[PDB]
């Protein structure tokens, strides 16, 4: 990763002009960073806006909250921007930023899903890690369907399997709002 | 396995029907075992066939397919614990002809709710913790219809590992007698 | 496996004079050329009394299923089918496939259907045609199963979506079974 | 694998009604075995049907033209039964069959495809190689145009990519003469 | 990790730690504490009468390495708010609770876990006795300090942790581990 | 295994079972069968069970004593090379007056181990089972020693090895086999 | 890598250094870089130097719609090899300003992937690389002038070019003489 | 192993036993277990007992020593290739008079070795243990050879490597086998 | 590597050392010296240093079509060995200013790679490494002053030379004396 001299990495330049990329899956070392950020960014401007990058397989739903929670408490707007992907937490996150600001690039995939885990144990323990992921999905739809403007019945439906959207199809949905056309 | 001339050790055993089952139960055991009781009830319908458990438990499908068979047959399946009956090994055993469910003095007896795993989607997870649990009431009202217990109190007394001695499980209704040297 | 002197035969084998055979493993080729074998000697041996065909097995190959399928409706000797301990997968389709009238499952067997399950690693082309493949497999499945239960084949594609775990009882009232052994 | 006291394994049992079982993939050991028992057979008789079930993903180039050179050798024709699948050189050692003689069941699958293999070395090491496989199609190729009467340029391009038949469609290809349908 | 530079040049992490936030965001084992301990311990001499901000996304850990963290949490002259954000977990979720009464927090979506401890012990009887009374020993101090934090009672408290149990941000302040839903 | 019947199975026609290795649940189950096969053969005559097995599983252990204890022959224990923990419980529970070690067999004596992981409740469950078996095992060993509960508690507190003479004066054995 | 290293160096004469397998790292820096230059000065060519073997298509078109997006003319230069998504980006450099160098190799085929579970995530998976093919094939015609019919019959298998065959395909304009 | 006897035991049918590999007690059992049946076969003649092992377990060798000096036949030891460590012990445990080793056999002779991990008491019972099993061997291998304890105890120190020669003037065999 | 590091510190002085295996990660660092270099004087010749075993043959075109493109001399030095690529790199260096050491040593060989798949796979993974090989020659010939068959009988096998043999071949210009 390159150095520019003013010595950042090209990484912490682009933090310089408020931009955040988010491109690798979401853990929480990951989340942790990105919140970071965040909060500097907010404690060095609460006014002026954020923008959010995201290229991103998708990662762990509770490190996404820490995201999404995060954009939502602090009083920049955080545009999002997804390039090549955003898949799974990736298009969650990319839903979340602030509306009318949210947008992907035309040859950029967004994928939507339900949450995946594992349990392992005894039935009684079986049954408590299968009712809180059911809840984890239930909370992830309604987010989802406040943020879209679709039903949650219609998330539910549209997200039992893998579902690919281009740019296109994900502003129709209402996963984003513009198309990015080019400068 | 030694061998005996008039067989290995266990085949001349089942020549006086005798079958011993000494390992944990998956499919393969059960294979073996059903086969056994079969063949047993096609030689004599009548007479009695010994049944010694000594077993940490194993596959629940396999397990059924032991105990369906026990039901099925005419012959009456005396069930004896020695050294262990545990988890799958301790419902066949209390799965034997009333009367006849035996342990050993210092057999161990010991009872828990299944176990299992479940990976995917929560959709798919959803399915595996429903067909577990749907898996366990089968299994604690069968239980309970064995030993004389609620299924309150079987569900209570399986929520996690409860070993019994062989005077325990007679008073809890899982055999009917310790066995007392001869 | 114990040994019985009548020669000397293992277990397997003595029960096999009395015409049954035991499928108590998973389904592949090996499996499958047993019995075949098994069946085909059957036949010679008498082509008018019945087989029975005990199933406890988590399923396995589709073709090596098929080797076993197309032989019982091939042979004369109608093959009872008897599920002991569970029947998943190819295992509930051979179940299915024993003669009507003679399709029987223990009171605490469990039955499982599902949809096929598989893989394709390679070029874009390559997994086409894997998919292909696969989903004309699950088509002639369907057909078959429908043809065994009298289920619609618009139904068998519902209920195959997800893993589906009938109780005896209930494979019997999906046509899966003819009757359940009581004791 | 169970037994027969008339004591013979299953196969073996089978083997004296002149039926022989192929249930693997094919490779040396399997050819050997099946070449043995071809030459077994004609010994035993040598104006009696021999009965060759297939149900085999496939395998060895050598070791399916071991079995293909017997069969065509021997004195009695031998009958191909497909069950289950039969895979590439499975699907080969099934068109050789007699013909007339050549069947599946109705479920069976036939799938036919190109030849595979690896090479590394050299570049000179790879032009043997590359040249060697090629050679080997086009023997497969015309082998198989003589046992179906498709033409090797069809043949050619129908085996580019893995071709799954239905059995109705292995005996409209010409790979085998007869899908056997049960009485029922 | 970026850098920001004001030439000093810091980490993301430095820099929030001169703004008195501490980001505790992983696994809490003996490293992590160790350098949470020391952020808390150089906060105080830095300023003893200014809030520290800890903010908690872990799944828990180690039970010492978390006493390390929870007892300098009550040694240090300023208060140290809590604020959960994605998950507090097991260790994590009894660190939330120990944060200044009225100053602990958790984010709207954030979720917080509550359990017993879980371990492992190998070897002789009188070693597993002593490592089994030890674990039932640790649990019971654990239980009788959340107790103090929520105001539950210690029977309440043994019998919601036998198992895994999952609380949203809203429940875990009826609870009483938080006293406030951080709302945007 | 050379042949005559394969040596052992040549052995146990004249009531001589051969306890050779580790003592697991499929050793157990075959030694619980010969000792069955044995009784029905003959039940008056003696039975002679060699130890030398470094011992093993608990509870495949008590379904040879069990088994030695509810059938009416005698079984003699014989000590040849090592009996150790189980191992010894074993050679221990043959018919009083008719167990023996040879003169440079050793004996060892020793607490049970095993391993517990999980919830705290479960590792609680775990020990308390452990420790219950430890009290069984005790007492068992006191009724077939003449030693009390507390003593053998303490002598098995660590790995306690003992020569023919003093497994003898332990009141493990009954004599020392001399040529 | 010598000392700025030796890329950052080149970096500040807005030339930016494509020698690797793209993946979703390699993309967040070269987007970042291009994202950089454009801020540095709006109206300068950026120089895209490609060495790669190909990868990930989605790390890919992060790069691809990045260059389409920023004002700067980019232009790239194949040195060594451009294959599979390489030789995708070669030919998304502004036109007029793609270039090889004599004995560049330039590699185009179809892409690649997996697909594992039940019949219908396959059928999904199929789905998705089919259409991910047909949208680069699409592109593809619009930078090279060929059709997308004849972009899918030779991209059938690995299609390996010459400089010279790649000016003739239409990926880039001219192959680089010596100066 | 050719062949109904194989030729083990076709050799055993004329009282000769082949000690061929380490000595552990899969080894042992089987060792024990012939010289029980020959024995019980005809208590007066004597039986052969081929060594040529590179030595294993002293708690497995002591049961073969214990039964051989235990039955009442003479039990001739005939060293060929190598008879090392517990290897040696047995074969100076032979009838006297009727121990013997081949022109070109080797005999090594040294202390035991083990293994001991854990807490400082437990170490200090292993070494305890490994201890009082050199003073025994030491004291046995002493009245077997005629040699004093304290000159064993020095001769066994490191690994000792003896011609058969050597090892009849040490009193470990009686005479060399000359062709 | 002491440290500038020890390597920029002759980069400094138009000195670039190849001292490994040629990877696309050498490459791409050769190639930003190079061009860096002309850029800062576009007239002072430049020295590289081979000491490599060979290897990626696309790797070697990078550096090698850098050499070609850039107006400075760049003159090679071969120490230890040059093997394989490396041997083709020393010989691309300007012509009466490609050397080696006395006891440097020069290998030469054909390309080799692998080929897995279907037969028409293993087809095309043939015809690309034959051309290579065709390419290769055909430079290889330019520079040497060899004929294309020659060099083809040459690197049929393993073909080891001396430095003094390096430049009978046409390889090198001059061994270095000291
Ligand atoms: B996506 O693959 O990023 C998806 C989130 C979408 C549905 C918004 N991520 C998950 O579902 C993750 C996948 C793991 C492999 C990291 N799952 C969880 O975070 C999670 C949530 C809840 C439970 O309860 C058992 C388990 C898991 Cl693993
Ligand atoms: B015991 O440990 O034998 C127990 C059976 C008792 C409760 C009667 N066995 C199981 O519960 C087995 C354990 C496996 C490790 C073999 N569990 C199952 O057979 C089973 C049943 C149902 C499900 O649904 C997901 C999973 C499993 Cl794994
Ligand atoms: B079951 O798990 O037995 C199932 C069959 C049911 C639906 C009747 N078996 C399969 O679906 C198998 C699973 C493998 C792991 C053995 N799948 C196939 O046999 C199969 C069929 C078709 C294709 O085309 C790509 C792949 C596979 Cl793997
Ligand atoms: B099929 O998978 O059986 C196929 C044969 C068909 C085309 C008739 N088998 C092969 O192509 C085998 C595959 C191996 C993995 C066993 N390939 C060869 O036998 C073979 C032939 C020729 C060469 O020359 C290099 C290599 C190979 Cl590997
Ligand atoms: B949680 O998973 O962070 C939990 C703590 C809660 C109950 C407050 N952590 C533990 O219980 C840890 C888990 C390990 C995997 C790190 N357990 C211990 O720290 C611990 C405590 C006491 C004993 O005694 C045997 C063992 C262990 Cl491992
Ligand atoms: B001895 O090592 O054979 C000893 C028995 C003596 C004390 C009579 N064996 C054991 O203690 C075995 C050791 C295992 C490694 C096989 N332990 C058990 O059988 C046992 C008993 C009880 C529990 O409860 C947790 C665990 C174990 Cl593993
Ligand atoms: B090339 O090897 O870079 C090729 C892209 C060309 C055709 C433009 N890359 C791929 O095809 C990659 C290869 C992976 C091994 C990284 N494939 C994907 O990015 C991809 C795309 C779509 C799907 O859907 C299932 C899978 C994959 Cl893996
Ligand atoms: B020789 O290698 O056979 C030697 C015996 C001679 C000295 C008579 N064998 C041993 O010393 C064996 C070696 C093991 C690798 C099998 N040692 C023991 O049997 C033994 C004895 C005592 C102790 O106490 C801790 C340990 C061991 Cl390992
Ligand atoms: B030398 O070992 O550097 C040699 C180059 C000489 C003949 C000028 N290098 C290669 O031949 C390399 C070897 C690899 C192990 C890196 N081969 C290739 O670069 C190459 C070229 C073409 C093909 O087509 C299949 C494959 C390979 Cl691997």
Do not use: W
Not at 16 to 35: C, F, P, Y
Not at 110 to 139: C, S
Not at 145 to 169: C, H, M, V, W, Y
């Amino acid at each position: 990763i390159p150095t520019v001299i003013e010595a950042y990495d090209i990484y912490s330049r682009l933090l310089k002009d408020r931009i955040i990329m988010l491109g690798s899956q979401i853990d929480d070392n990951v989340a942790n960073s990105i919140v970071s950020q965040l909060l500097f960014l907010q404690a060095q401007d609460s006014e002026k806006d954020i923008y959010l990058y995201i290229n991103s397989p998708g990662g762990s739903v509770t490190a996404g909250f820490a995201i999404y929670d995060t954009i939502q408490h602090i009083k920049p707007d955080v545009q999002t921007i997804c390039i090549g992907m955003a898949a799974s937490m990736g298009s969650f996150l990319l839903a979340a930023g602030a509306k009318g600001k949210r947008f992907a690039l035309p040859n950029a995939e967004v994928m939507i899903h339900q949450p995946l885990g594992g349990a392992q144990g005894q039935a009684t323990e079986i049954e408590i890690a299968a009712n809180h992921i059911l809840k984890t999905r239930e909370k992830l739809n309604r987010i989802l369907s406040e943020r879209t403007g679709q039903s949650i019945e219609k998330i539910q439906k549209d997200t039992d399997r893998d579902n690919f959207l281009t740019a296109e199809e994900a502003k129709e949905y209402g996963l984003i709002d513009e198309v990015m056309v080019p400068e």
